[PDB]
């Protein structure tokens, strides 16, 4: 039943990412309000720029974590559905690709891997037919509702901010920034 826990983790990651987005928007709007507020306040401007920088960095991190959780949910759902379906219809497709898997039996590692890859390309050529004709198909009815909640791939808002990559030094310094932000917010 770990699919439910994975779904809950994805949902709370999405909620946390939305919280990060709205607080980043609030920081940006107050910063732009202070831009026209005049009166220098150079130290305040610098600290607000640091705040918005760490906000956008943690927004990017939360978006990446949400994407990772979403793809983990997709993977676990796929593996569970395939496992139950194979327990339901194993023999039919086992006999469809019979000769390679029947000669598989017990062999050496290289021969076993060669048979496995032959089976993979055979089923690739099998699936290419419906990849070509491709009529519409929906989610599995057993657990569609959860798949309905996530729907398609994560939205562009969760991936448009993940284009850039940060070196480990950047990650370390921004983690220090987050730690000092938390320490100064606690007081």
């Amino acid at each position: 039943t770990a699919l439910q826990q994975a779904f809950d983790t994805c949902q709370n990651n999405k909620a946390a990412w939305l919280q990060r987005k709205n607080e980043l928007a609030a920081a940006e709007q107050e910063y732009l309000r202070l831009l026209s507020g005049e009166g220098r306040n150079v130290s305040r401007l610098d600290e607000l720029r640091n705040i918005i920088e760490v906000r956008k960095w943690q927004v990017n991190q939360a978006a990446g974590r949400y994407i990772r959780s979403h793809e983990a949910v997709q993977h676990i759902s796929i593996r569970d559905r395939l496992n139950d379906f194979m327990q339901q219809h194993g023999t039919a497709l086992a006999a469809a690709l019979a000769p390679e898997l029947m000669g598989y039996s017990e062999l050496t590692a290289i021969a076993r891997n060669c048979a496995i890859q032959r089976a993979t390309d055979a089923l690739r050529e099998a699936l290419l037919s419906w990849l070509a004709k491709g009529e519409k198909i929906n989610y599995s009815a057993q657990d569609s509702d959860i798949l309905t909640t996530i729907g398609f791939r994560p939205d562009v808002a969760s991936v448009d901010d993940s284009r850039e990559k940060f070196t480990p030094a950047q990650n370390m310094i921004f983690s220090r920034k987050s730690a000092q932000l938390a320490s100064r917010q606690s007081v």
């Binding site: 720029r49 920088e53 950047q170 310094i173 921004f174």
Partner: protein, 209 residues
Amino acid sequence: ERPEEVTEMQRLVKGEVVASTFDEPASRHVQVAEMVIEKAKRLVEHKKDVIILLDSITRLARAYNTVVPASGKVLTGGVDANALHRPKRFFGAARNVEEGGSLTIIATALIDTGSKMDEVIYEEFKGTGNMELHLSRKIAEKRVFPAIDYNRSGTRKEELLTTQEELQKMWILRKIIHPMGEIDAMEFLINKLAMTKTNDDFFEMMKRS
């Protein structure tokens, strides 16, 4: 200092400045320095940011050495362990408070003054600060000011002080200015930034022209 410098500072600076010429003995200097540092300590205790400019640590240390009683152990150059421990309490107050207030200390040191104990105590003060910048006589000889040496100067853990983009600007400037010499690089940077208005404009006009 001479009365001229203290008078011109007190008639030029905005905030209150504490000064004491050499017309008074060293004990006056010791007492005024200790009372100023403890007053600043109390002010930062009351959660108030305070910045202390010290000019100079070498002369204050010399006065402390002249005034400190001898403990029987004297190093080379007529300097005692307590003779350097006494100015250490004045100098080491630089730290930050997380719940409010700050006590920043920026100090200057004198070298090549003809006395070897000056550079000895400078070496003792080499690894005590987290920010250092040097001044070169030859750079100031060319009548280009300030005579700052970009390669020699540096700040410890400056990444946390500034943002990421400012760090990138600072380090690309480091990579650009590092290869060539000091005087040529200084004059090149000062003339290229002279035509600008602010630092950000200078960075923008140097990064992509």
